[PDB]
Amino acid sequence: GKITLYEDRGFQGRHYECSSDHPNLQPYLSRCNSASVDSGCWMLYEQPNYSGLQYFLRRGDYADHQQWMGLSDSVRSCRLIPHSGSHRIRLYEREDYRGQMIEFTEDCSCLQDRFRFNEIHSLNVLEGSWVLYELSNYRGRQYLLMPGDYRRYQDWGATNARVGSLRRVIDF
C-alpha cells in the first residue's frame, strides 16, 4: 500500500507519504484536506492511535475531505487494511450471537432490505475485513471490522447498534 496525505485541498500543501500503518501523524501533518491512494485500502482516523471517527479509502484521489465523508480535516493516524482473499460476516439480532442471524459474502447497500432490524447487537467476522456503516448506502459513521468475534456493538467502537450498510474491503 501507498497513500499520500495533503494538508490542503486539491493535493496542495505539506504532504506525507505512508506505506504502512502510522499511529501518529501529528508531527508530520497538522491537518488533512486531500489524499491520493496509489494502492491498498486505508482507514483514516480522526485521532492518534486508530481512535475517533474512521474513514475508509481505496485506490483513488480525494480532492477534499468530504470525498471520504470526513466531518473535519483532522486525520491523526491511518491504517493499511490487510488484504483478504475472501469475505464472510454474520450479523445477529441480539448480543452474544443470539437471535436471528444473516450471513453475507458480498456488499449490502441496505441492510434493512435483507434483514429487518435497525440494530445489530453482535456479529461474527469469519473472513475478510469489512466496513460497517451506520446508514444505508454507505453513509454515516464507519467502523472497520477485522476478522474476529464481536459479542456487542461496543466491540466495534460504536456508541449504538445502528447499522444500515456493510462493505467488503477489497483493493480493486
Author numbering: 1 to 172
Article passage:
Human gamma-D crystallin (HGD) is a soluble, monomeric protein expressed in the eye lens during fetal development. The high expression levels contribute to the refractive index within the lens which focuses visible light upon the retina. However, this halts further expression of HGD. This means HGD must remain correctly folded and soluble for the entire human lifespan in order to maintain visual acuity.
The room-temperature serial synchrotron crystallographic (SSX) structure of freshly prepared crystallin mutant (R36S) shows no post-translational modifications. Crystals were prepared with 20 mM dithiothreitol (DTT), a sulfur-containing reducing agent with a similar function to that which GSH is expected to perform in vivo. In our structures, the fresh HGDm crystals incurred an average diffraction-weighted dose (DWD)28 of 0.19 MGy after 20 ms X-ray exposure. Fo-Fo difference maps calculated between the first and last timepoint revealed no peaks above 3.0 r.m.s.d., confirming that X-ray-induced damage was not responsible for the absence of Cys-DTT in the fresh HGDm structure.
